[PDB]
Design a protein around this ligand. Structure first.
Ligand SMILES: [Mg+2]
Ligand SMILES: [Mg+2]
Ligand SMILES: [Mg+2]
Ligand SMILES: [Mg+2]
Ligand SMILES: [Mg+2]
Ligand SMILES: [Mg+2]
Ligand SMILES: [Mg+2]
Ligand SMILES: [Zn+2]
Lengths: 114, 139, 119, 56
RNA sequence: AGUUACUAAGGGCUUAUGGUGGAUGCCUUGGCACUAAUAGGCGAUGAAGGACGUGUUAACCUGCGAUAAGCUUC
RNA sequence: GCGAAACAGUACCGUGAGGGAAAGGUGAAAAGAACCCAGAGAUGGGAGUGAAAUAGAUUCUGAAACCAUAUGCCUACAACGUGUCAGAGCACAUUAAUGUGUGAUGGCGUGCGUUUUGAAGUAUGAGCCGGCGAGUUAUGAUAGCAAGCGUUAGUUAACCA
RNA sequence: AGGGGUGAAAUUCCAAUCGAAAUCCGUGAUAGCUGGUUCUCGUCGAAAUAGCUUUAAGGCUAGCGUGAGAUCACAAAUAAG
RNA sequence: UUCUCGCAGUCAGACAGUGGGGGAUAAGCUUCAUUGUCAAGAGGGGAAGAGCCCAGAUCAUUAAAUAAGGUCCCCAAAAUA
RNA sequence: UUGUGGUAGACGAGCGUUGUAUUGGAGUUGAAGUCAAAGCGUGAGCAUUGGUGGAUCCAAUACAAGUGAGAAUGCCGGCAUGAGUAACGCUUGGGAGUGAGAAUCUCCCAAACCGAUUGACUAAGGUUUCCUGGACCAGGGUCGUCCUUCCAGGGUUAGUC
């Protein structure tokens, strides 16, 4: 018994090529390059799915530092004024968003002054 | 309302025919026949005859207006090739490949004629989604 | 590279000039390349101007240039010149010929030009 | 001297940008009607109002 | 003094088409390997293999041999 | 699959022994596309036959690499293993989904197999696409698992029908 | 006419090839030596040392991995004395 | 990690700390004993580094506290004396 | 509750393909194959709709294997890039004619090389290349109305060579 099987190979390569669309040049045409680029893209996806929560926290810190620097104290002093006194688990983003709807944030920053 | 005309396996290159086909495309027919006759190219004596034949096909067969015509869309697709051997120093026998071109010229009558192809494109997906939806009634 | 054609040696240029002036006097029109026509015109004009006096010195000086053609032989072409072509132009200061450009050739896309001469 | 890396379909198309042709100047001979390329004699054999050739 | 839509010689991405090109799929007067019977040779009465020729018909293939794409007889 | 589905041991290479290929499919049936227009003509476009002429003699289907055309978006101060995570504006509208295509701009980012102590590698393999292509078989040995049969057990080989 | 020939000798020439022609066959020669060896998910997870080796780019046994089974307290680990 | 049975792989190692040989208290040198790491292992620090320091990735989260290292801007984070 | 990085390497469970067997069943009211789409799965992989296409095929359980391709300076076919780049392999000017079309063909006139030869006769070879008429798929390093190419017809005549 002889088995040729050109169906399965083409279907597999078609899936790999379909994965990489919107790629420059031949990367979406030739399969040999498409597989390399899909592998590399998924590596980058795995690394960035961690780097982005590494970075968004930093952005929230930055936009909280800026808001507090216009009241007379720094972010590195505000965190004490949440943990030790008036123990609060308000998150590190929402205290950021509260500036985009301000004058409810000022209530926070003057509440810890007690 | 297109009335094309095609010549197959002309002994010209595809890449030399595309140079004058660019000259002729999008322009009106009165300033295409003459502008193509007057240019000094091998790819022009081979397209003047074809363009005039397309003119005659449009005018006789389909029955369009004539002085409303314009060259809708021009190409020189790759026709079949010929493979030949060429001697060399010390007998190494490179392969010369003679080219060819399947010229085709389309002559539209109404100035737009392009949104209609898009309309057919959109219908061909509208009916796909519609057949998809009518088969969601599997309950 | 090595073995190469003799090419457009100066003798080739001058002999082409002689043949073309013979041909233009014989018939009265030439259909040649433009950039040989502009070069033939000078010698044409010089001959016709040198040929209005008809002494034997002018016959000798023109014998140095002409060649026989199918229409006229050289000693017939000399008489044909000095009898009807040269005296016709005797009052025109310069401007004995014109070179007008034809259409490009199919073989080479060279700029064909016609050389002729009329009053 | 050879290429070390194949010049893709992108670099090649960019090079041919300057290859486009020019539409040669066209005039309309008086004494008959037709589009002779300018500064030539049309197939009439007439250049302007002067005759330089045969019928065609 | 300053802000910013438009350009695209040409390129890039997607989507649709057209051309070359002939893989995948269906098929086959073909091959492969075997079984059961039969038979296990042809040849100076000139073989095997070949040339050459023959037509109402060009060439080629086939059949055939100056009785020559056929003759006799049951 | 015989080297060979067809005029194959042909064409072809070689002085010679000898070496030695590739390619098939219209349609049910030629009803093989009279006639007209353009053209020198092949041919093409209508007509006509036919279920279909995107079946037209390039003849079953007709992917990919590859070459051209086009709607939509971006690009002419910009350092780029060419993608990813964010993200504007723009244009559309689906295997109805916290949707689709492009993606000005920020952060981040030295390919794949191989062999090597260690390669982005100034080490090597691959131009690209498709197809073909590499731990099987006979007869015995031991081990694991399962089954039949069993305490004077178990078990057939050749051969014959 | 080839484990031959020819050579005013050079390892010359022997059908564009000659430190011993060309093609066929044994023949799928052998190669501790390069290169290649094609589908997925889960569990566990090393060595690059010792002895010997006409051995040192390889091989055998021990050492180290894994699977199946037993030992289950006196065996093996980890701290103090 | 002891014993028996099946199945292999491996025998070209590298660097940093420590104690010495050869070396010239020279080598990213060579040869050993030892502790790690890499190999066969990603993340953060180190500007960039296979082998150093911290650590040991099932996958998603635009959640919180930390280790080494670090807080003028690039680059997230600090002030007083 | 303890865990879940991992090459060589041991072990386990699995997807897919081709065919056979029985069991169900779909198909010209359009089967497989092929492209396209904004689906579903932990993965190998699997559906749905539409265009094309024009006759076989899908699922369940076992069974048997030419059973699964990105690499072998792999084999075969196609196609790019380099590139419309180098090359085009010793020589002219014109008149008249033909023809749809001429540098390139026919005639004429010169012109330029050969001349112990590019001349004339034959042997060896080659095997119709010779002559006339016609054609311009391919070959001609361009073109071509023309060729030593192709097609139809033709030609080789010995007592003494
Ligand atoms: Mg290199
Ligand atoms: Mg250019
Ligand atoms: Mg692999
Ligand atoms: Mg190299
Ligand atoms: Mg160049
Ligand atoms: Mg150059
Ligand atoms: Mg050149
Ligand atoms: Zn005119």
């Amino acid at each position: 018994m002889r088995i040729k099987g050109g169906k399965q190979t083409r279907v597999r390569r078609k899936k790999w090529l379909k994965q990489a669309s919107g790629s420059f040049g031949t990367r979406h045409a030739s399969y040999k390059v498409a597989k390399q680029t899909v592998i590399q893209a998924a590596k980058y996806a795995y690394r960035d799915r961690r780097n982005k929560k590494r970075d968004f926290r930093s952005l929230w810190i930055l936009r909280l530092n800026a808001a507090l620097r216009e009241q007379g104290m720094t972010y590195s002093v505000f965190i004490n004024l949440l943990k030790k006194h008036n123990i609060e688990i308000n998150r590190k983003v929402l205290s950021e968003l509260a500036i985009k709807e301000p004058s409810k944030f000022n209530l926070i920053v003057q509440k810890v002054k007690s | 309302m297109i009335a094309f005309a095609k010549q197959f396996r002309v002994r010209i290159s595809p890449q030399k025919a595309r140079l004058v086909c660019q000259l002729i495309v999008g322009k009106k027919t009165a300033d295409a026949q003459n502008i193509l006759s007057n240019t000094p190219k091998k790819a022009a004596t081979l397209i003047a005859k074809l363009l005039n034949s397309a003119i005659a096909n449009a005018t006789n067969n389909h029955g369009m207006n004539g002085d409303a015509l314009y060259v809708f869309e021009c190409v020189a697709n790759q026709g079949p090739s010929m493979k030949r051997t060429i001697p060399r120093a010390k007998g190494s026998s490179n392969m010369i490949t003679k080219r060819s071109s399947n010229l085709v010229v389309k002559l539209s009558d109404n100035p737009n004629e392009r949104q209609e192809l898009i309309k057919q494109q959109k219908a061909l997906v509208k009916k796909r989604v519609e057949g998809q939806q009518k088969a969601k009634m599997a309950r | 590279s090595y073995i190469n054609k003799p090419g457009k040696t100066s003798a080739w240029r001058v002999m082409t000039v002689r043949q073309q002036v013979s041909a233009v006097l014989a018939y009265g029109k030439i259909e040649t390349t433009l950039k040989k026509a502009k070069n033939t015109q000078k010698r044409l004009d010089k001959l016709i101007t040198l040929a209005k006096v008809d002494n034997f010195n002018n016959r000798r000086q023109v014998k140095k240039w002409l060649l026989n053609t199918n229409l006229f032989d050289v000693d017939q072409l000399m008489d044909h010149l000095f009898s009807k072509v040269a005296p016709k132009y005797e009052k025109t200061p310069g401007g004995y010929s014109r070179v007008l450009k034809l259409g490009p050739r199919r073989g080479d896309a060279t700029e064909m030009a016609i050389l002729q001469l009329t009053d | 001297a050879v290429q070390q890396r194949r010049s893709s379909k992108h670099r090649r198309d960019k090079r041919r940008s300057h290859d486009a042709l020019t539409a040669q100047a066209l005039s309309v001979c008086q004494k008959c009607g037709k589009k002779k390329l300018f500064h030539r004699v049309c197939s009439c054999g007439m250049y302007g109002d002067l005759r330089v050739k045969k019928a065609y």
